[PDB]
Design brief:
- The structure is a homodimer of 198-residue chains.
- The first copy, chain A, has 198 residues and is mostly helical.
- Helix content of chain A is 48%, strand content 12%.
- In chain A, β1 and β2 (136-143) form a beta hairpin.
- In chain A, α1 (20-42) runs antiparallel to α3 (64-85) and α5 runs antiparallel to α7 (174-181).
- The longest helix of chain A has 23 residues, at 20-42.
- The first copy, chain A, is globular.
- The complex binds manganese (II) ion (MN) (2 copies).
- One manganese (II) ion binds next to α1 of chain B.
- Chains A, B: Its EC number is 1.15.1.1.
- Chains A, B: It comes from Staphylococcus equorum.
- Chains A, B: InterPro entries: Mn/Fe_SOD, Mn/Fe_SOD_BS, Mn/Fe_SOD_C, Mn/Fe_SOD_N, Mn/Fe_SOD_N_sf, SOD_C_sf.
């Protein structure tokens, strides 16, 4: 069965960029619910033995009778599993992907500007992503717990823009949350996701 | 043409069921944004001089270049316009629709249970509605700022289940918010919307 992964740092470690109370609820409540409901959906079926990456990549072929529960809770589980590892108290803006960003956009600042614009323009619940699409870097957003993996695009950076991810600290000010995010991006994890990209 | 309606009560009037900070941001920031963006979408079109009820009811007829902008911001304006008028510090569980609820569900409690299940189960951003469909009462939910008007079903009660509507006070506990909602329902406005229902 699927398990709630521990955070790789304390609940306070991303302060003041993300508040401890949000990290605790977002992990212990929101992610845990996705794991509970994912397990209920796949329990005693062949899906129970697969990686969450494989299930979401192959979501469009999951049996119709559970496909929605797997979309929501499988997506939820994968997206938050990625997110916790893509955050760090020791962010360093360097490495393979930062170098590739600088060459494609001209500066990290120009990339951050486009990412912030795409992330702010996601209407309702969802995620902003940096993806590898056919060997090119592309910024896309997805609704609810959808993941670009499902459409053959490998996510290497994600930002949760569900209001639960930012409302306690930022309320309506999603752009201020996006600004604070840059301070805690784990570019080592971004590089790892980019290198593993098929 | 379109204007941010003033609340029928002070920001503090719905305490302790809905916190004053939420009432203030939700109206002054979230609703105001929908009005700004709506005005920008319809500036120099026939829509300028239509009611928002007519625009949303006939969404499928809006020019396609601006239809999504009108779905989002037109929806946002109508939904929040209804919501403010459907809340009150003087909630009385009686009248035309309460009687019709008791007759159809057997009890207000039975009706609340269906509304609570539908409202809690709506995944991502959206609204839970009591509507008139072919003269009968139905509970439905919509995503984002979609409104049942567009589907020819008349909304007479709505609950905002976007996380911005409840996160500051209730965080993940959407059911506790839904439960607190009953204390501030304006059943007089519910009756008025029902009586108008065409
Ligand atoms: Mn989340
Ligand atoms: Mn709202």
């Amino acid at each position: 069965a699927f398990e709630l992964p521990n955070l790789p740092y304390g609940f306070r470690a991303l302060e003041p960029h993300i508040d401890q109370q949000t990290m605790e609820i977002h992990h212990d409540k929101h992610h845990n619910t996705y794991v509970t409901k994912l397990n209920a959906a796949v329990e005693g079926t062949d899906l129970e033995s697969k990686s969450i990456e494989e299930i979401v990549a192959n979501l469009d072929s999951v049996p119709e009778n559970i496909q929605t529960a797997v979309r929501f809770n499988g997506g939820g589980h994968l997206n938050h599993s990625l997110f916790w590892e893509l955050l760090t108290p020791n962010s360093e803006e360097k490495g393979t992907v930062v170098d590739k960003i600088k060459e494609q956009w001209g500066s990290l600042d120009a990339f951050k500007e486009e990412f912030a614009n795409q992330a702010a323009a996601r209407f309702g619940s969802g995620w902003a992503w940096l993806v590898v699409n056919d060997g090119k870097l592309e910024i896309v957003t997805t609704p609810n717990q959808d993941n670009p993996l499902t459409e053959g695009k490998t996510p290497i950076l994600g930002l949760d823009v569900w209001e639960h991810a930012y409302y306690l600290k930022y309320q309506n000010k999603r752009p201020d949350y996006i600004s604070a995010f840059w301070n805690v991006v784990n570019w080592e994890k971004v590089d790892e996701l980019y290198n593993a990209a098929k």
